[PDB]
Amino acid sequence: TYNVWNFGESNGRYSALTARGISKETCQKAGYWIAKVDGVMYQVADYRDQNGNIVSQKVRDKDKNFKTTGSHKSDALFGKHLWNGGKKIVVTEGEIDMLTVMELQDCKYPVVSLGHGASAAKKTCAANYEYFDQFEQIILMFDMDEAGRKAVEEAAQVLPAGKVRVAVLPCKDANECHLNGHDREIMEQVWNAGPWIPDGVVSALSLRERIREHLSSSVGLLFSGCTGINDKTLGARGGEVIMVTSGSGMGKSTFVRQQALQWGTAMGKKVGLAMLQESVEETAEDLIGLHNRVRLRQSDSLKREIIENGKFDQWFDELFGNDTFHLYDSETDRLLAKLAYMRSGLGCDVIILDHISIVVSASGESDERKMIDNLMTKLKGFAKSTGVVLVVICHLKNPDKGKAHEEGRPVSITDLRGSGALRQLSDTIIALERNQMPNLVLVRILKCRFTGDTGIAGYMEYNKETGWLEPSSY
Amino acid sequence: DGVVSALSLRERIREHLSVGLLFSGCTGINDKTLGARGGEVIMVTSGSGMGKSTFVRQQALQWGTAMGKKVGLAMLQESVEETAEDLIGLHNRVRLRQSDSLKREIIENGKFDQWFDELFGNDTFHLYDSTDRLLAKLAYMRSGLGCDVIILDHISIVVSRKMIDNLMTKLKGFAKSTGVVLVVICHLKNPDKGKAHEEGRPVSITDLRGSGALRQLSDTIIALERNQQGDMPNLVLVRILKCRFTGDTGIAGYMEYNKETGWLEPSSYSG
Amino acid sequence: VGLLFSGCTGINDKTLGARGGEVIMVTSGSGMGKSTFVRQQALQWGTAMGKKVGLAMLQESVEETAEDLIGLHNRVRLRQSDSLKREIIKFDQWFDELFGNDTFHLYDRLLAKLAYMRSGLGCDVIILDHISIVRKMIDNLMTKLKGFAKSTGVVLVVICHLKNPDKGKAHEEGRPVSITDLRGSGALRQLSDTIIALERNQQGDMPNLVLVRILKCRFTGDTGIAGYMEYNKETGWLEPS
Ligand SMILES: Cc1cn([C@H]2C[C@H](O)[C@@H](COP(=O)(O)OP(=O)(O)OP(=O)(O)O)O2)c(=O)[nH]c1=O
Ligand SMILES: Cc1cn([C@H]2C[C@H](O)[C@@H](COP(=O)(O)OP(=O)(O)OP(=O)(O)O)O2)c(=O)[nH]c1=O
Ligand SMILES: Cc1cn([C@H]2C[C@H](O)[C@@H](COP(=O)(O)OP(=O)(O)OP(=O)(O)O)O2)c(=O)[nH]c1=O
Ligand SMILES: [Mg+2]
Ligand SMILES: [Mg+2]
Ligand SMILES: [Mg+2]
């Protein structure tokens, strides 16, 4: 705080470092020494300019604190003044790493250190562009941490290209490789380092193993109720978005719960339901009677009879014997956190997002379209990063003229309600239509990205006594 | 001052003029707009699921092998393994992704490595893995790789009105300074009256999402249309919408899809 | 009367040509031919008029806008014929025929360059090719250019664009460009002196018949349909019919 501390007025001494692994000759060469002020021994490093004049002290205690004695610039490097050229420099992260590298080479290669570290490296590298122009190769030697990789990624932009090489280490940095006897690896990473490879670009030649293992694993997961759906779309796949549409009360949820039953029972996949039309008391209740080929909630006489005889526990045990059903009950930020907890932690493979029109209309926004677009692209980014089968349910809008959508109207692809990016970022669109013959439902495949065949996929019938979607003939 | 006289400019004009890249399939394009040139930003437009990626992938495949120029992709929409498998299947005439029993054959026969080194044997193709960071990556590809064709697969997911105008001015300044051939895919807006774009509706230049400067800062716009719920779903119509260098616009030709192989090949059709 | 226009000879029949101190705007859509129409007036005011012309190609480079002039003066579509670009490389005789004088001055912060072209060079026709790459920043720029044109008295021709129509056909298919269709703000139809619009049926029977519309005139005042020009794809000159 006061001024540059002189070694005479602070009882200075140039000695070795036993617990770090640095002899006294390298500390005599650089200028790292120890003062005795305020009783406790304080270590101190010296900053010089390009000429060689002392500009700053840096004082560290026994409990790893920092203390600048005065004006701290950004164009001041720890270890810069000793060299004024050369063919190869090694840039470190901390300050003991410079002593570590100059210990093992007997002062033969120019080694500099940063004055801020990895937090403010871009500021001290942008102002130091002119010092690195007189050099021929630059070897960056940072930590093997997240902040170290971020600093070596973001600090190689302001430097001249073609000279910046990055080395890897099995330690944290150079000092643990100096302590643990790994003095044979750090001497090879200086002379032979890794060339340019920024994250984001991938060469087409060095991709053989990933393409080899990628066509080995997924694929499959057939549908149910009809054959033409699997004849045209070839099932549901990881990383896709299948969007099922209908009118009002046309059977857009019954088909999805039937597919959830077939995918949770016949194939053994963990299924995560996000039902927002009803509570969790109902969407786990109808599956019992649907597996037992009846209508459970739609008959009051059978409810008391299965309460009395104890058959309800038998029906609960024969269905939910495995942990294959994860329910959810009802901002748009925490819902994706729930889906990430269902995908990463518990391990779901089929995630159903029912009735999306009450997560874009229940949020307070002035403009609905940008919110729908941002939600859809963030959900697609989630489904592409994790790679999970994701079914999403949305609705239709009002026609301009003619019949209504709930009386046999053939739907078009522009009838999706809310925006026009619901069909641009979805991977399969299935529409269900019927006419109130009140049970003849037809399936229209509007868009398929995997195959190409669209149009009428088939016909089904809804059973009013059991609750299944049976295939018909017509 | 940075003014330029037209008197002391003789050698710069003489050294400048000392056709360009051609399109594969629908040979009425390179007769009408006279092929692709350096410093161009080409726009590709169609409806939802009409074959924009399918059309641009064949152009990448035919500019990566028969011309010998470096090709840089940017698949912002999907993973690089999918587009790599699609390129490998498309060059060897055999539809690979949409066949399950054929993918497991070539990994155990050992001829997959015979397919891999035939087309990726050179350092031609360079893939990208998913605002200013993407521009920095593309500028790094152009500087330290020297690629001639750069493909941007989906511009709608880049937007996370003036934010699109600034991006388009920045891409135009990049393609003007570096002189790289840039291909950009963009989408159409929701029609408010009549049929949809997927049932053969003539696409105008008005239908562009986001802003209105997508047609004021680009050099050429190619639209593709095809009747989806119709009699045949593969006969496409190609429409040139704007060309600064030639000017002649309109209907170019017709192509079919060839469901077995996947090559967009031209065919004959009167009207 | 002042400066005359070459092609569409109903303009100087209606607004009596251009005059000093004016701000001329050409408003058309994408693919209508705004740069070719202003290029022709740049060519016809540098050799037949004898006036110093200051260009500002903010949209294109300086190599294309010079080769375009060299080709257009010699009746040859130059930049699009590959065989003729290597046949003539007689090129220096074509070069010193129109660049042998000190008439044309191209351009590769902008107002300082324009004030240096007016003061230090003596240019009387300043052409600004693209304005959209530069509500406050547009109107402030228009008032600064208006104060500059009032202080100096230089003819100024600036290209701007049209907005996106919300109902009906587009501007590229025969819709008449009204006075409302201007981007940025509403001061573009209040601070200029004349507005010339070009209309041509792109997706039509013939794409090479442009109609010219006058939208405003502070001297004569009469507006409406001017005439009809053809393009002559072999040559490239907009000629009236
Ligand atoms: C498809 C179909 C449904 N139904 C009955 C079963 C159910 O009681 C009801 C539809 O079941 P739901 O799936 O609950 O209705 P929905 O999802 O279409 O409506 P919403 O948009 O509000 O979510 O109609 C028939 O009777 N015949 C049929 O063909
Ligand atoms: C071009 C074409 C594609 N197809 C089908 C089969 C192809 O595997 C599939 C590929 O279409 P895509 O290229 O994936 O469609 P897209 O990229 O334009 O749409 P998006 O914005 O969602 O990315 O389309 C046909 O059936 N007939 C055709 O003529
Ligand atoms: C006027 C006219 C131009 N053309 C052609 C010649 C040129 O290739 C092109 C000229 O149009 P441009 O002058 O380039 O149009 P623009 O400047 O308004 O738009 P932008 O630069 O953003 O694209 O059109 C014709 O074919 N017939 C015509 O009548
Ligand atoms: Mg429902
Ligand atoms: Mg695509
Ligand atoms: Mg122009």
C222-227: long-range pairs with CB below 8 Å, 24+: C222/C14, C222/C15, C223/C14, C224/C14, C226/C8, C226/C10, C226/C11, C226/C14, C227/C8, C227/C9, C227/C10, C227/C11
The DSSP secondary structure of B126-172, one letter per residue, reads EEE---HHHHHHHHHHHHHH--SEEEE--STTT---HHHHHHHHHHH
State how far the Cα of A167 lies from the Cα of A91, in Å rounded to an integer. Answer: 11
Cβ separation C30–B4 shorter than 8 A: no
> Cβ–Cβ contacts within 10 Å for residue B257, how many?
19
Any atom of ligand 2 within 6 Å of the Cβ of B223: no
Resolution for this experimental structure (Å): 4.1
**SS3 letters for C160-228?**
ECCCCCCCCCCHHHCCCCCCCCCCCCCHHHCCCCEEEEEECCCCCCCCCEEEEEEEEECCCCCCEEEEE
What are the DSSP calls for A81-109, one per residue?
Answer: TT-S--S-EEE-SSSHHHHHHHHTTTS-S
**B55: closest CA among B219, B179, B239, B242?**
B239
Rounded alpha-carbon distances, angstroms, from residue C20 to A168, C26, C145, C149: 70, 17, 15, 9
**Whole-angstrom Cα Rg for chain B:** 20
Task: Give the separation between CA B252 and CA B254, rounded to whole angstroms.
Answer: 7
What was the elucidation method? cryo-EM
Return d(Cα C82, Cα B245) in angstroms, integer: 13
Which distant-in-sequence residues (6+ apart) come within 8 Å of A92 by Cβ? A98, A101, A111, A112, A113, A114, A141, A142, A173, A174
Asked whether C17 and C44 are in contact (CB, 8 A), the reply is no
Cα–Cα distance measured from residue C91 to residue C74, given in angstroms and rounded to the nearest whole number: 11
Which atom from ligand 2 is nearest to the alpha carbon of A454? 26
| CA-to-CA separations, A346 to A218, A269, A323, A351, in angstroms, rounded | 19, 12, 10, 12
Residues of B in contact with A414 (CB under 8 A): 190-191, 196
Q: In what order do the strands lie in the sheet with A164-166?
A: A111-112, A89-91, A138-140, A164-166
> What CA dihedral angle connects A334, A340, A342 and A345, to 10 degrees?
-120
- For C105, the closest of B3, B212, B241 (CB atoms) is B3
Amino acid, res. B178: T
Q: Which three-class secondary structure state does DSSP give residue B21?
A: strand
B33: tokens are: 């707009």
Burial annotation A67-99 (CB, 10 A radius, 16+ → b, else e)? eebeeeeeebbbbbbeeeeeebbbbbbbbbbbb
What number does the ligand 2 atom closest to the CA of A427 have? 22
State which H helix or E strand residue A430 sits in: strand A428-433
Q: Tally the C-alpha atoms within 13 A of residue A433's C-alpha that lie toward its C-beta.
A: 20
| φ/ψ (deg, to 5) at A162 | 85, -10
Which subunits sit against A, judged by 3+ Cβ pairs under 8 A? B
Mapped onto helix, strand or coil, the DSSP state of residue A117 is: coil
Touching pair A, B by Cβ (3+ pairs < 8 Å): yes
Task: Report yes or no: A135 and A163 within 8 Å, Cβ to Cβ.
Answer: yes
For each of the domains in chain C, give its residue range(s) and CATH number, in order of start: 1-240 (3.40.50.300)
List phi, psi (to 5°) of A234: 60, 40
Amino acid, single-letter form, for residue A7: F
Token code pair at residue A352: 């159903």
CB proximity B201 to C under 8 Å? no
Residue whose Cα lies nearest atom 27 of ligand 2: it is B234
User: Using CA atoms, how far apart are residues C42 and A15, in angstroms rounded to an integer?
Assistant: 80
Tell me the two tokens of residue C20.
Answer: 């000093």
